Structure formats: C-alpha cells, structure tokens
Paper text:
Structures of all three forms – complete, or in some cases partial – have now been determined using X-ray diffraction or cryo-EM. Both Mycobacterial and human cells express the α2 subtype, and notably, the GlyRS gene in humans encodes one product that serves both the cytosol and mitochondria, which has obvious advantages for the design of selective inhibitors. Similar to the TtGlyRS, the two Mycobacterial GlyRS subunits adopt the canonical architecture consisting of an N-terminal catalytic domain and a C-terminal anticodon binding domain connected by a β-hairpin insertion. The catalytic core contains the class-II specific antiparallel β-sheet having the characteristic insertion domain after the first strand of the core β-sheet, and the anticodon recognition domain adopts the HGPT fold also found in HisRS, ProRS, and ThrRS.
Crystal structures are described for complexes of the two enzymes with adenosine monophosphate (AMP) and glycyl-sulfamoyl-adenylate (glycyl-AMS) at resolutions of 1.65/2.90 and 2.25/1.95 Å, respectively, and for MtrGlyRS in its apo state at 2.85 Å. MtrGlyRS was readily produced using standard protocols, and 37.3 mg of protein were purified from 2 l of culture. The two groups of synthetases utilize different insertion domains, with the group containing MtrGlyRS having a zinc binding motif. A few of the modelled MtrGlyRS chains are more complete, however, owing to the presence and stability of the zinc binding site. The liganded chains are generally much more ordered than the MtrGlyRS apoenzyme, although major sections of the insertion domain are not visible in the various electron density maps.
Residue numbers in the entry:
A (entry chain B): 2 to 101, 123 to 130, 134 to 461
B (entry chain A): 2 to 83, 141 to 258, 262 to 343, 353 to 461
Amino acid sequence: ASIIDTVANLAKRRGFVYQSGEIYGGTRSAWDYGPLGVELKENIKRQWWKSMVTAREDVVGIDTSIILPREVWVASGHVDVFHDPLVECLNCHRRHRQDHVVCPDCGTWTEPREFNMMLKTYLGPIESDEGLHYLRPETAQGIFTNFANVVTTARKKPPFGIAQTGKSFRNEITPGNFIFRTREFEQMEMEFFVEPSTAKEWHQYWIDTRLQWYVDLGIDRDNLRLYEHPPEKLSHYAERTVDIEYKYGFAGDPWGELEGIANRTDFDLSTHSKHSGVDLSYYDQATDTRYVPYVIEPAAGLTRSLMAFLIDAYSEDEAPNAKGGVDKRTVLRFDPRLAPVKVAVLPLSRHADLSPKARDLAAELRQHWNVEFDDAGAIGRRYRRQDEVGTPYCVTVDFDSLEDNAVTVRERDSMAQERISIDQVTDYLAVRLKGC
Amino acid sequence: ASIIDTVANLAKRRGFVYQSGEIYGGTRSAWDYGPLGVELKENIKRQWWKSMVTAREDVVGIDTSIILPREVWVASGHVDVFNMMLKTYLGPIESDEGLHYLRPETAQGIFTNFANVVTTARKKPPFGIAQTGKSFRNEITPGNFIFRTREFEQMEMEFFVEPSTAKEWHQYWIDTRLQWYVDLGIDRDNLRLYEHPPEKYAERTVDIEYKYGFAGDPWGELEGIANRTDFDLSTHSKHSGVDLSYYDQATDTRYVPYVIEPAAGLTRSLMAFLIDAYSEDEKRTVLRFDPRLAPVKVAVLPLSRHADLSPKARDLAAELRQHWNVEFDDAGAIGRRYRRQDEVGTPYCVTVDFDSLEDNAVTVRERDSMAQERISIDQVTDYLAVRLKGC
Ligand SMILES: Nc1ncnc2c1ncn2[C@@H]1O[C@H](COP(=O)(O)O)[C@@H](O)[C@H]1O
Ligand SMILES: Nc1ncnc2c1ncn2[C@@H]1O[C@H](COP(=O)(O)O)[C@@H](O)[C@H]1O
Ligand SMILES: [Mg+2]
Ligand SMILES: [Mg+2]
Ligand SMILES: [Zn+2]
C-alpha cells in the first residue's frame, strides 16, 4: 500500500477526518475534521498566525466576508478568466477537464466549452442578476479592497503585510487524492505591499521565509522543493510565481503544490482603483511621491499543509514491547506545537486508588493543554495508541505515586521515561511543549 | 447619542470593522474585521473553545463542511419549514442535480457524525460535540451594526445525554454559559434569561439576552440554549438508514440520546463584549476588556524616538511579541499614546525612558487604574504574563 493510503486510513480510523455527510454518501471532495483533526488544523493555523501577524511588526491581520460584492470579481478578472475547458463525453455525457483520448467514466467528445470555476449564490428573494454573488475563490480580494482602510487605521507604510485565513470555494470538477483537492478549502494568505523597486528582493525573502517555516515545524527539508511557474501557467494576476512543493507520495509524480508565493506587481490595487473609483495608491510623505505598491503574496493551504504535516510525521519504527520482543510501531512524529493531544494521563490500572490522583492531574493539565485520559486496557497498548496520533508525552500514575507523589513522564519518540514529582509536572511539560 | 452608535463609530475608526466591499458600496449585512477586530474575534472564539473543549473531559471538538449533502437538510426539516437557505450549484451541470445549500447552522454537521465521534473518541452519554464555523442565512433586512448579517460565525455545542437527565443538564448549561460571559467581564446586570413560551426541532429553549442598547427594546438574543429532545438523532437515523442511537453496555440498554444545545453567536458575542467594555471617565474613553479578549495585550512606548531609547524599546517589543500581540508606538507625546491605547482596551502600556538606560527598568501602566510601577526588564514578561491570564 502507498504511504498516502496508509496515512489516510489512519486519519479516518482515529478521527482526524470523516467524509462529510458519510451516512448520506460522502465524496473525497468534502471532508469533516474530527476531534483530533480540528485541533491539528487549528494548531497549524495558530502557528501560521503567530509567525505572520503576531511576531511581525510589519504584518497585520484581517478577516473578510466569504461573499463580497459581485463587482469585485469583475475587477479582479475572475468573472472573465477564472474558467477551464470542459469536454462532454458523447456516450455517457459526463463532463471532464480537457487539459487534464479516452473517457475515465465509460472508456469510449464534444467541442470544449469554457466553464467558470467560481460557485454562485443568490442573496435576496429574487433569484436574478441583482442578487448574483460569487463565493470567493480566494481571500486576497478582501485584503486588496481594504488596503487603504488598513493603511489608515493601522498606521502602516510599505513594506507591510495584511494577512488572513478563511474558507474559499472552487467548483472543482473532480475530487483530489484524500483531502488534497476539495471544493471547499481553507487558505492562509498574506499580501505584502512593497515599493516596486524592492519587490524582487522582497520576493526572494518571502520564498525563503515561508520555506523555513515548514522546516521549523518539523517537515524534512528533503521533502520540500521550489518550482518556478512558466509564463503559460502563470495566473491572470501574476508576473512571477514560485511554488513550494511537498513530496506527498502520489502515484506517478509524488510532488504537489503546498504554497504559492507570487509577485503580483501592481495589478490588484490598480484594477480595484480603476473599477471602484477609489484611489488605492500609496503616498510616501518622506519623499512626496505616490506609487501603487507591488504585492508579494504567500498563499498557503491550511488543508494541504495539514496533509503535508501529517504525511511527513508518519513513521514506523521497531519498538520493544512488554513481552521482551520488538513490534512495528506506528508513530506520528509531530512538532509539539501541532500535535492535537499534548499529554496523555494514564493510570497504571483501573484501580480505585490511582484514579483520584490521575483525574486531578488530568484536570490541572487541561487548564493549559488539550489532554487525554485513558484507563482502558494494558498500559503499553495505551502508550502505542497515543504514539499512533502523535501525542508528545504520556504521564503514567502508578501505585508508587500514592507514596512518593510522583509520576512517570514518557517521551513519545525516544520512549524514554523519567520520574518527576507531580507539583512540577506542569512546568516540565511546559518547557518541552514550546507554547507561548 | 445612543451607545451603539458611539461604539460603532469607535469600531470603524480604529479598524475593528470595515464594511465588506466598502469601495463598491457596503451594507450592514456584511462586515470585515480589521486588524483589531480579527484579534478580538479570535480571542473570544479561543476562550469559548478553551472553556468548552480543552477544559472539559466530556466535550470534544469537530469542524464540518459548510456545504453538506442536500439530504441532510431534507432530514433536519430545514427544506420544509425554515426559504432562508442560500443555494449553490456544484459540478459541471447547473441544475437541481447539483443543488446544494449553504448550512444555516453548524449543528447538522455534528448530528450526522454523532456515531463517528462516539466510535473514534470513545465517548458515552453524557458528552458533547463542539464546533465553531460560518453559517449563512438569507436575512431579508440587516440589523444594527453587525448584529444580524447574512454570513455569521457560530459557536455551537450539542450535549448528548440519557433522556431522564436532560432537564437537569439543561439548567446546568443555562447557568454555565451565563457565568462564562460574566467571567469574561460582562456586567451581570446587562444579562438576563428569556424563556421561550410554549407557543415559541425543540421542546424547551432559553435565550441569554444582552442589553445591547437598541432604540426601543434594548435587549437582544446573545446565546440560545435549547433542549432538542431526541429529534435530531432520530430523524437522521430514519432518513440516512444509519443507526445513530447509543448502546450502553453497562445496562445493556439502547436509547436515542436527548440533546442540550448551547449555541452562541461569535459576532453577537463580539458586539456584546464591545458595548459592555465601553466607558468614559475623567475626560477619557476606555474599553475595559478582559485581558484575554483585548486585541492588543501590551503597547511599548519609547519616551522619544531616539538612538538610545528606541533600540531598547524595539528589542523589548520583540521579546513580548513572542507571546502576545503587541503594538509599538513612537508618535506624539506619551499621554496621547496612552489615550490611543486606552481607546482600544490595551491592558498594559510599557514606557522606556532615560532612567531605563541606567537601571534597565521600564514603566508599566495598568489601563483601568492608570497606576504605574517600575519593573526590571528581565522580569517584565513574567509580570505581564501573570496579569494577562493567557496567550
Ligand atoms: N482545491 C484545493 N484544495 C485544497 N487546497 C487548495 C486548493 N486550491 C488551493 N489550495 C491551497 O491554496 C494555496 C494557494 O492557492 P492559489 O492562491 O490558487 O495559489 C495552494 O498552495 C494550496 O495549498
Ligand atoms: N444572522 C445571525 N447573525 C449573528 N448571529 C447569529 C445569527 N443567527 C444566529 N446567530 C447566533 O447563533 C446563536 C444560535 O442560533 P440558533 O442555532 O438559531 O439558535 C444565536 O443565539 C446567535 O448568537
Ligand atoms: Mg503584528
Ligand atoms: Mg476534550
Ligand atoms: Zn464517457
């Protein structure tokens, strides 16, 4: 079995993901995130927002509506150019992407017809062109349209960034491998407005910076690469684009896009100034000059980043068991800051004397972290159940704990154990979990 | 001038919110959150998730798609009795085949995964499933400011319980949820319970109402806490064909759990916290945010822009930005800067003066009292941490 299939089976089995509406028929085009998946996803988001907004004086945040005025997508060009060629089979009449011959539904074509990938909706009582709106295909336009508002309230000046996370929607004709390509996804996008003569320099900076981010949160550098977009595959808003690519493990070419870092020159502020009538240029008072900023844009995928982190973390190693033998052990080697469960509190047995201390310790820890309590089954099996989902530390409460008031901390990867007094455990875990 | 108008002006001016698509004509049915608004929003959401999911053994989280299968909303009864749902068309053919609905609530995503969560999370009633997410309603008319919009964020939790306990649990959550708003700094006097009467998917509903200050009747819904009986799990079993009941092996019994549903509005909660924190004293304008909600936790202020002070101030601001959202301000007189920070609820201001070059200490000013205390720099992070009560 391939690595992607293994990781997907693990995710479904342990509740990182469920198929949306599974009981009514789910597709790989729609996924719900279970109790572990939601925490993993939020953790990745939080680390992104820390790196991009909180830690940087030059970058501020925003959250804009999924449904913007239609004119926006006329000015961005998405109405006119955000379309792909579709060919309908002449035997089963199922439409497919032409660029992407034989039919993959029956095997037996019409002339290509352009199909716009944005999703439509209607606001108001009349299902008419007055109420036609597009579910945004990208979060960038809500940033561009607020560039001046932000310059004003935030008192900012180029170079500076506006960052955002949110849901986007594309009418994807076919579902991707697992969660890679879905019709509803979550993006993390930042638009960095710079004085044009510096754009190129700034560009490389962000390409490097973004790359290091993935490495800093645990992704093997060898599983990452850079790809230069050719002029033909350039977006309608881009002059130069570089993609970070991750080795996901697909059949055939195992490499796939992970984050797109684009030099969008002055396109976006220009077009929105032209269409809205509002001047979105920037006035440098230190020089008495006025220019439309260039835009460097790191746009990552939350769900693609979760898939990348989850695949890179997966590993199988030979770990000794209680019998004195050696088993194959499935471990997700997450960075502590991403792991969905930071600590597991595991009484040695269901004994009535161990549950009080174990439960009080679980509560104390829940004050700070997401915690898991499990007294079911043999302890070693529970250690492995936690290792399977990337839990960084297991805290075992045994009978000696009733006398020395100390517990056994077990580190996930090394499986090494250290006995520490309870009244210090929190502190211990804190230093090793590397939160704020 | 009403308090709502004043707060809305302040929110617009300091970039708490902007009207979505302002340059193309905005409406009160759509609002973006600016640099401060996003942070206050995310802080409210984070405190809700900490209270509900992280802190409780008996509650686990989930996040389900906005667009679910159409049969889901045929089974929940929204297609027949709710039309306020927003439609969209998936796939290459724009017809009733691809017709889907944008969820008007986040609950059905939970109900349909009840059995999945019981299985993977190894949970047994009483336990809850919590979710935050975007919901859409084709609201005909927009509300005051950001109170009623077509697109909003919800914080819903469904607590599944053995039926004979529901009523008790119901009251519990009613009280619990209320305390939450109070523990985060809303005045108890501005909160009240409103019992839905028998005439008004549910059996019994209590709304926590906040005194927003509307013209006329200044009260409004802030959070609804309903007892939905066994309606939802029942209907999804029947329509899907999948048994969503629970089997207790301790008693060898099988039942359809009853559901207690606290459901709060992220945007309504933001509007309530903002209106409540607003205040004027001597004159000064202050948002008395709880530290955990304040969009900016600390502002670093050099006495003057100067080669001796500014580097020390910048270094300190970075150290603090490791943990909290910080604001660095070197413009204008120090008291002007204090006023600017008080206006947006910043709990603490740190000033670097010339004395700081000699005793390596700074001046920490507590927003509400305005009391100042001189703290060594190598301790400021701990000093602030103890007082900010989260990061
Ligand atoms: N259909 C999709 N499903 C999941 N992630 C996506 C999808 N489309 C785009 N992304 C992510 O969004 C990022 C930016 O997209 P773009 O703005 O189109 O370059 C990509 O690098 C992906 O990580
Ligand atoms: N259109 C809306 N705008 C803002 N908040 C809303 C809206 N609809 C519902 N809510 C919030 O969601 C909570 C639960 O709603 P419900 O599921 O309708 O009981 C309410 O108490 C509100 O706080
Ligand atoms: Mg920042
Ligand atoms: Mg929990
Ligand atoms: Zn065919």
